[PDB]
Amino acid sequence: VTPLDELQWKSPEWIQVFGLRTENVLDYFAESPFFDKTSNNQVIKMQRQFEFAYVDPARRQILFKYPMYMQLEEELMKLDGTEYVLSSVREPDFWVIRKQRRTNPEIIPLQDYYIIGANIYQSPTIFKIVQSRLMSTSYHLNSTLESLYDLIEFQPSQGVHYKVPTTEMLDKLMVTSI
Amino acid sequence: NPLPTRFEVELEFIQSLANIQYVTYLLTQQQIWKSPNFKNYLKYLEYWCNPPYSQCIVYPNCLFILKLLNGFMESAIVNEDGLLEGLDELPKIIQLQGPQWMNEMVERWA
Amino acid sequence: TGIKLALDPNLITLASLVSNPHEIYGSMPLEQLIPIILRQRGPGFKFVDLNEKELQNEIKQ
Amino acid sequence: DRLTQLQICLDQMTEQFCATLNYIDKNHGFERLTVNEPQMSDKHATVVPPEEFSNTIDELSTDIILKTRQINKLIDSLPGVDVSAEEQLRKIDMLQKKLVEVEDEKIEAIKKKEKLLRHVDSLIEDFVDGIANSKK
Amino acid sequence: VSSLYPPPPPYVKFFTQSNLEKLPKYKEKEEEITCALDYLIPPPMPKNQQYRAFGSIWQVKDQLPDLESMGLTQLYKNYQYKIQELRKLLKSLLLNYLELIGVLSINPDMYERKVENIRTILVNIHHLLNEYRPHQSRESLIMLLEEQLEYKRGEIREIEQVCKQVHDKLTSIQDTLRTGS
Amino acid sequence: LEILNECHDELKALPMLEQVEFEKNTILQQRSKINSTELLDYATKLSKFTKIPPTFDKGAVGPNNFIWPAEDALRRGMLAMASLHSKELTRIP
Amino acid sequence: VDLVTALEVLSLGRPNLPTHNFKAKVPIGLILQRLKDLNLTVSIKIALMNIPKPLNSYHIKNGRIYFTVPNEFEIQLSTVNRQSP
């Protein structure tokens, strides 16, 4: 079993059928397992299918750049709970979706999900990244240290050392010949 | 719908060696190259090299990949416990030379 | 089926795969050709070891 | 390879047709039925001088039919129009036999070059060991 | 949620050493499976010769489909006849484009069947080209055999070119040897 | 003697005898291997795959399926359902 | 139609690509031919070279020329072409 962070998720079948642009990242992420099936985003999506403060300027550029997200957040301010908004975009292919709960207003952020090359990734926290790197480093130095120790030989007549595995007048002849 | 025949499944798997992503997905599991049955299957599959079995192949670079990996097999000896020595570093060769082979055969496509 | 076909295998593209070891060794000039010769002859091989009668009775085997 | 250029010429016909239709749909003007009716212009409309409009119409038309002469000449130059598949096999088998024969002929040609090769190296080795015995 | 790639087949489990040694004995003695020794003999071609692979049907010997078999209009059906058919087809294509311009320059609503006519002309032209393609491929193989003939014979002419350079340089050395005599 | 030396070394630049003898052997081996109808049928099988399509500008189309099976080709292919129906493939009498 | 790759399949069972890994070999007839033409090379190299009386004893053999002085030394030398020493 692999938990939620170490998996890259994509639906190229959904890319073949619909295609991914700056507009349809929401339902593409809804098809991803990262999406909450009890979120406020999907209930307002079912309801709609049937300047502004308390936001950072990074989302404000998105709202003033794309309309469907600004009536998305205009429907989202009415309700409360976990939501899904796109903080930054880079056409042709880069997106990010943040988990976000809103209370009345007060907003905290949560886990993000960056999209690269129409492939949904869970944004990892850096502690387990450097922890995995240190797993690799520590195991590798463990292997080096164990593989080194078998070559080490100690004698009492000398110091501790390594296991030993099981003409000089020609330069003067050269310099005298010339 | 009849069952997929042994010919069809073996042809689709032998054809899948043209993509390097499939083989670098397969070679990262230790139990796959550790298994001597998979090694024998690798020496089973050269019957696609001879006609008329080669006629149905669409991308012959899979046959090239099959012929390439077999040169790493005579240097490998299987023991009584099943540890296949010599296969610890061949997948590393695959990730080091991965883009090289497929870019080379893409430029041969052009 | 039909009839067979024999092709010049070395040249298929107009203006290689068949490794005939003669045109891929005798074409190059000797000054850089000798190094790969004594590299492929053996490890630690020297120019002093090459001989007439050695190759003359090596082809006789 | 000729059929490939033919297909390129065919969809070049189609691109020329849609390009001429696009040009005549977008860059046409507004024609006076009478002189007393008002002639208005739009800043969102690509108005062109009518004389160079007609000149561009003429050059579009002439490039269409010069590409048409290219198509006709290329189809006149299609490789093999009078031969059948049986004629193709009757060419292939004699080409097979001729290739086997010219491999043989190249074998005796290389044999003659080898005649000359050991001739010239025998003269060279006789010359050099003669002068080596002379000068020693 | 499953893996990205399918697993290796269950047929790999039968490749055991007992099966390897019993394979020549079984040889001395679409498949109907009877025992484990059937999985070491490679399976023959399907009798239907149309096998499913990668969501499509291939064939052991592909034949070019007709327009009627595919469900379209084959206007015209040893290739001189097809060459003249192609010539009439291209002339009809040019005339039908002129007719399409005429239709759009009186009534831009009746063009729909004219576009269908242009479609039929184009698909007949393309299918005629693909019918000529095995003949064109045979001509390409003829060209390749002629090109290898030409390269062998060009090797011949360069052989006697270098040889004649040897002969007239030999006449030169004979002349200068007689001069030095 | 030196002009005979350049004559000898320019004549040395030609292919030798056993090279074309081995070439003849390979030509007869290809006589053994290749059949004309088989070659043309197999070559026109690969006609739409092993080269770039000489009709597009290839700035919007790539070799996802032209040289190797694509990811989505394996997804929609019958091998994908062969993976799910592998239990029936394990059914051996 | 793509005749070259079908020819590669019907020849080897694989297309032609450069091989950085095993999937060279020097002929012994070729190396003896090059040995004897290099012996001819070093034999005609000393045609333009004057030879001293202490070193007129030489043996053009084994791809070399054996410049020898009796009971003193024997040095064997070779060249790559004519214009280089």
Q: Position A60: which residue type?
A: R
CA distance linking residue D86 with residue C3, whole number of Å: 12
D100–C4 CB contact, under 8 Å: no
B61–F68 CB contact, under 8 Å: yes
Quick check: D60 and E110 in contact, CB under 8 A?
Answer: no
Shortest distance between the Cα of B71 and any Cα of chain G, in A, equals 5
Q: Which residues of C touch G7 (CB under 8 A)?
A: 7, 9, 12
Q: Which of F43, F78, F93 lies at the smallest CB-CB distance from E53?
A: F78
Q: Which of C2, C6, C20 lies at the smallest CB-CB distance from F19?
A: C20
Is the Cα torsion angle D25, D26, D28, D32 positive or negative in sign? positive
- Contacting F with CB below 8 Å, chain C residues are 1-10, 18, 20, 22-23, 26
Q: Is C4 helix (H, G, I), strand (E, B) or coil?
A: strand
Cα G11 off chain centre by: 32
Q: Which residues of D touch C2 (CB under 8 A)?
A: 89
Comparing CA positions, the residue from G73, B40, A53, G25 lying closest to residue C21 is G25
Identify each DSSP E strand in chain E by its residue range: 50-52, 57-59
- Contacting C with CB below 8 Å, chain G residues are 3-4, 7-8, 11-12, 16, 24-36, 38-39, 41, 61-64, 76, 78, 80-81, 84
State in Å, rounded, how far the first CA of chain A is from the last one.
78
CA distance linking residue F75 with residue F82, whole number of Å: 11
Quick check: G23 and B68 in contact, CB under 8 A?
Answer: yes
Residue to test with chain F: of G10, G26, G80, most F Cβ within 10 A: G10
CB contact, 8 Å: F21 with chain D?
yes
For strands A119-121 and A152-154, give the pairing: unpaired
Comparing CA positions, the residue from B90, B92, B96, B82 lying closest to residue B38 is B82
Question: Beta partners for A102?
Answer: A81, A107
Breaks (C-N over 2.5 A) in chain D follow: none
CA distance linking residue D85 with residue E82, whole number of Å: 13
Burial-class residue D5 by CB neighbours within 10 Å (0-12, 13-18, 19+).
middle
CA distance linking residue G52 with residue E97, whole number of Å: 94
For D41-64, give one letter per residue: b (16+ CB within 10 A) or e: eeeeeeeeeeeebeeeeeeeeeeb
Is the Cα torsion angle D32, D33, D34, D40 positive or negative in sign? negative
State in Å, rounded, how far the first CA of chain E is from the last one.
97
CB contact, 8 Å: D117 with chain C?
no
How many residues comprise chain G? 85
Quick check: E123 and E72 in contact, CB under 8 A?
Answer: yes
E166–D95 CB contact, under 8 Å: no
Residue that is written with structure tokens 């092993």 in the block = F50
Question: Beta partners for G65?
Answer: G60, G77
CA distance linking residue B85 with residue B36, whole number of Å: 11
CB contact, 8 Å: D84 with chain E?
yes
Quick check: A33 and A9 in contact, CB under 8 A?
Answer: yes
Shortest distance between the Cα of D55 and any Cα of chain E, in A, equals 19
CA distance linking residue F51 with residue E32, whole number of Å: 39
Instruction: Name all chains with 3 or more CB-CB pairs below 8 Å to chain A.
Output: F
Residue that is written with structure tokens 């107009």 in the block = C14
CA distances from E135 to A81, E124, E128, F44, G14 (A): 70, 17, 11, 12, 27
Q: Which residues of B touch G10 (CB under 8 A)?
A: 51, 54
> CA torsion, points D103, D107, D113, D117, in degrees to nearest 10?
140
CB contact, 8 Å: D135 with chain G?
yes
Q: In what order do the strands lie in the sheet with A119-121?
A: A8-9, A119-121, A106-116, A94-103, A81-89
Residue D24's region, left for phi above 0, alpha for psi from -120 to 50, else beta, is: alpha
Breaks (C-N over 2.5 A) in chain C follow: 15
D113–E153 CB contact, under 8 Å: no
